Structure 1
Amino acid sequence: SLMSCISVGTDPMPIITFLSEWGMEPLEDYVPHQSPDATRVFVNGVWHGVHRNPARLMETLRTLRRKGDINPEVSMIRDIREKELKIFTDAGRVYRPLFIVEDDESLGHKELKVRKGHIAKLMATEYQDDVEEYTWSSLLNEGLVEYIDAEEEESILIAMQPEDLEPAEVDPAKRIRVSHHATTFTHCEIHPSMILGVAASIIPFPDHNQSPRNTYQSAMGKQAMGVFLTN
């Protein structure tokens, strides 16, 4: 799809070394009787220890990755019910970005961490074409947008579009949607239309078509005839 990228892989050592000095007791000292409730900890499918207070551990790594010291490719999944915490720095994973919903507010409810302020700071940079250089990266380092792989995706609850879904609580020609009954969103999609690849991003109103019809055009358009390069 358009937004999706693919990890290049990093070194797991810093994370492990970090995990050690944050409560992960090594495996050699593990005795399931005394630690009936510990959480296993994996790093690329290597059991590395257990942890006894993983909830505090998780949210530490997250902000440590939202700060930008854990390279944001890195996926970290806490599987509460299986008592497991998994981390991959593996190369080759497929991931896409998402807005972070912080259920924090003086507004007293959840809302995206990115506001008109940053939007302005962005459009200022595009129309630069005097430097404050708000780029994509700044949205990363400020903990506004996260990469999410497909495994980590299991443990989030994405909102579909901010407006229609974050604030709590009609044209009959308009299509019919359902509600924000879910109150625990932890992410919002940047734009739902970004689930389409390149070829299908040229169909107009692909949501008014029969599905195979979009597969056809998406394969014909490759044998249209245009200008292929200006030179």
Structure 2
Amino acid sequence: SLMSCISVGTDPMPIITFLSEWGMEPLEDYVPHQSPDATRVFVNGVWHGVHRNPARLMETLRTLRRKGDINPEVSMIRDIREKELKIFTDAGRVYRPL
């Protein structure tokens, strides 16, 4: 379609480091009991760890990608129903403005 566009990919490492710095638990000390409801975080499929308060991260990443500090091809989803949070930054996605 007319305003369609194609993602060209961007290195996920700044996002990974950033997202660690704003509060994660890296998977190596995750335990299901002590965090019975915290949210999984994925980046291009690879799990990177669990996080406690998801909404603050979600709005923060929205503000950051709206301020122009993340390449706006990056797409995030908070699937609230399943305690999921996905970050996608590969090439080859299809997106349209809004």
TM range (shorter): over 0.9
The Cα offsets for residues 2-25 of structure 1, whole Å up to 9 and x where unpaired, read as 001000000000000001011111
Instruction: Encode CA deviations 1:151-208: one digit per residue, 9 max, x unaligned.
Output: xxxxxxxxxxxxxxxxxxxxxxxxxxxxxxxxxxxxxxxxxxxxxxxxxxxxxxxxxx
Q: Per-residue CA shift, 1:38-80, capped at 9, x if unaligned?
A: 0000000010011100000100001000000011000011000
Please report the TM-score for the alignment, with normalisation by the length of structure 2. Answer: 0.97
Off by >2 Å, runs of 4+ in structure 1: none
Q: SS state of the match for residue 40, structure 1?
A: strand
RMSD: 0.5
> Percent identity of the aligned residues?
100
Greater per-residue strand proportion: 2
SS in 2 for 1:18: helix
CA distance in 2, matches of 1:74, 1:86: 10
State how far apart, in whole Å, the 1-side matches of 2:32 and 2:95 are: 35
TM-score, with length taken from structure 1: 0.42
What's the CA shift for 1:37? 1.1
CA distance in 2, matches of 1:36, 1:16: 24
Q: Distance in 2 between matches of 1:95 and 1:60?
A: 21
**C-alpha deviation, 1:88, in angstroms:** 0.3
Q: Which SS does the other structure have where 2:9 is aligned? A: coil
**1:29 deviation in Å?**
1.0
Q: Which has the higher contact order (CA 8 A, sep 6+)?
A: 2
- The answer for the alignment partner of 1:13 in structure 2 is 13
Q: Which runs of 5+ in 1 are unaligned?
A: 98-231
Q: Distance in 1 between matches of 2:79 and 2:90?
A: 19
Give secondary structure in 1 for the equivalent of 2:70: coil
For structure 2, list consecutive stretches of 5 or more residues without a partner in the other structure.
Answer: none
d(CA) in 2 for partners of 1:91, 1:29: 32
